[PDB]
Amino acid sequence: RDKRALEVERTVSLAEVYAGLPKDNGPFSLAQEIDKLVSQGSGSAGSGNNNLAFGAGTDTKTSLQASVSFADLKIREDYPASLGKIRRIKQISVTLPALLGPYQDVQAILSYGDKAGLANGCEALAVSHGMNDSGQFQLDFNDGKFLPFEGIAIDQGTLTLSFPNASMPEKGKQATMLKTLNDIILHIRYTIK
Amino acid sequence: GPDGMAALSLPLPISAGRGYAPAFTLNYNSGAGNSPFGLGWDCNVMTIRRRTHFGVPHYDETDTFLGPEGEVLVVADQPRDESTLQGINLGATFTVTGYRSRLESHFSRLEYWQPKTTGKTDFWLIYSPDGQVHLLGKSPQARISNPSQTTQTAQWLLEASVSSRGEQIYYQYRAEDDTGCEADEITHHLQATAQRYLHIVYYGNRTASETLPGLDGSAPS
């Protein structure tokens, strides 16, 4: 039953996703809303599963996070049905085009909020710097274990990217970085079987 | 002045004129390149030219030209057709369009005459506030164009001009000619007559006219 799958890398701009939401879902400028949300914490932008907000838990109230559903990304429509019906994520990388202070790091967690049968720990990825980043210090597709987010269908579920010390009123260390940040880019490597 | 350049002016000893004359000055400009008058010096004889500030220009229609002061020419008006100039039969219908410099400073009007009839060449006319008309690039010799495709005129050199009171001036250029230049000097270039030099300027009319002295392109006696 094995087959060589078609390996496809999809660049995703969250700014395009939010700017492009249906009028009724509250489209927005990602850079503009982040700035407002950082300067004044505990706000929100967008709607449903395509939005910006501060985390609800006490542990996360200073954390600003963005989220997008796969259903809205509609990656699936990029390719015809004749190539196969099963389309699943193999690896997700993250890029953050912000300016940094002289020795500043970027802290962020990308996670699948719809955790199900996915092996333990593969529901989330850490960002340390961006640049097509990864949850592993070394990325190896021949690792032997499942990679973060591997096996998630490209058709449904929500990814959320959390920035731990984003609230400006709390003097979060990432607040200036986020005001500075222009977009969020995901690189989704998925395969078609 | 404003850019800190060094400069000198050495007027040519042209004593003759009738209130109108081809008066030129040789000028030093630091930062200037190697000209017909050596490195750093020139006379800047007036010409209309394609702008090269943005690279090799097109010879098509989406072209940019500079006025005689070296400034961008913006189409000023809409084209009209005309077959004569100052009563002189040009031998063909031309479409003529007016131009105006982007940054005004003189209020002259510039016309571009582009032959409607295939086989004729184009020309430019400057209508000066003083009531003078200056014709540039009408005939070969006054034209800088690609020797391999001579219709691709890059520059229109002043060929003729006339004042309102009847005095007119004709400018004769002599093209580069590969005589006595050395075999490699000729062999590795083979430009086939590019570059023009001012050779002689004719002024002081035996007969008055309000028309351009270049007439239909005929050479002066």
């Binding site: 020795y103 640049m131 690189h187 | 060094a6 000198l8 630091s30 190697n34 750093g40 690279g55 590795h188």
Partner: protein, 336 residues
């Protein structure tokens, strides 16, 4: 950062103790610093798995937000792609070169134009960069035209193909006068620069303990080389570098030999103290003698900076390059 050394009036130029930059754009891993707009502001240009775009650096050191661009060539990252001006516009375009044709993507400032394949006229055959280790294939204004021509330097001659724009080249022409032993000749030792300063670039061949500088006769071949010797104790090898810049603001670049080894050393060879071909003097033989002196605008900026120091009046510079200006003149009466 450059600063004037000592008081205003002290011409020497030095640099301040290095400081970390207060703001650095992220995404530094697959990027380089190139002005791609011709703005004067260098652009940190990022390529890779998408993320095409850049951060420009403003005169106050402020970096812009990421600029996405609207058209980067796929071939931008091709192993042989060059950055060269083949339009004549001064922007630096993207090009691949084969022997009969080139593939040129014009720089439109906000991205690149649709690439075009340009076939050369007649049987003009272009040199191909990297094709022959014994020859240097590079763009340089060897003719002094301001356009940058394609030049091939062999041990026996320099061949040049004029840049006619839009990827079109003229026929090769010979530029005689350059010569080195053929076996020993190594393009790695060949550097081109307008040390003369009038336009056409000179050819500097580096040897242990010496420099051979072939002067460019305005595109008509080369002058017999000037051999300059190194100071005793100074040697040169393949690990050593040659930098070229007008670090002192004289209008003429100086040659800096950078020697690593166990302790870095840097040597500067000034060829002249003044930019050649500028008019220096005039005399009318009636008793009036004139003389001129020139200085880089960049030295005047360093004074503006020195004045700003102490006073705190941040000297933001809006003039990115050293236009050379007239500084001082004198006029003397030989009679009185």
């Amino acid at each position: 950062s450059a600063q004037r050394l000592g008081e205003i009036g002290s011409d020497a130029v030095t640099w301040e103790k290095m400081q970390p930059l207060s703001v650095i754009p992220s995404l530094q891993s697959n990027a380089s610093l190139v002005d791609i707009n011709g703005d004067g502001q260098l652009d940190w240009v990022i390529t890779g798995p998408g993320l095409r775009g850049y951060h420009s650096q403003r005169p106050d050191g402020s970096w812009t937000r990421f600029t996405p661009l609207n058209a980067l060539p796929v071939e931008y990252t091709h192993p042989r792609a060059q950055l060269a001006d083949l339009m004549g516009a001064g922007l630096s375009d993207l090009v691949l070169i084969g022997p009969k044709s080139v593939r040129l993507y014009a720089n439109t400032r906000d991205g690149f134009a649709k690439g075009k394949d340009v076939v050369q006229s007649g049987d003009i055959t272009l040199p191909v960069p990297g094709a022959d280790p014994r020859k240097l294939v590079a763009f340089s204004d060897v003719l002094g035209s301001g356009q940058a021509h394609l030049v091939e330097v062999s041990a026996t001659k320099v061949t040049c193909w004029p840049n006619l724009g839009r990827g079109r080249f003229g026929q090769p022409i010979t530029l005689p006068g350059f010569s080195q032993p053929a076996t020993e000749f190594n393009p790695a030792q060949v550097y081109l620069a307008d040390l003369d300063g009038s336009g056409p670039t000179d050819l500097i061949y580096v040897h242990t303990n010496r420099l051979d500088i072939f002067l460019n006769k305005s595109g008509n071949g080369f002058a017999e080389p000037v051999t300059l010797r190194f100071p005793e104790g100074l040697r040169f090898d393949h690990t050593c570098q040659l930098q070229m810049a007008d670090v002192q603001g004289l209008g003429v670049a100086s040659l800096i030999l950078s020697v690593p080894h166990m302790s870095p050393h840097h040597w500067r060879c000034d060829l002249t103290n003044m930019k050649p071909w500028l008019l220096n003097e005039m005399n009318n033989n009636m008793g009036v003698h004139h003389t001129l002196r020139y200085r880089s605008s960049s030295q005047f900026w360093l004074d503006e900076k020195a004045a700003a120091l102490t006073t705190g009046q941040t000297p933001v510079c809006y003039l990115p390059f050293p236009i050379h200006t007239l500084w001082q003149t004198e006029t003397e009466d030989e009679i009185s």
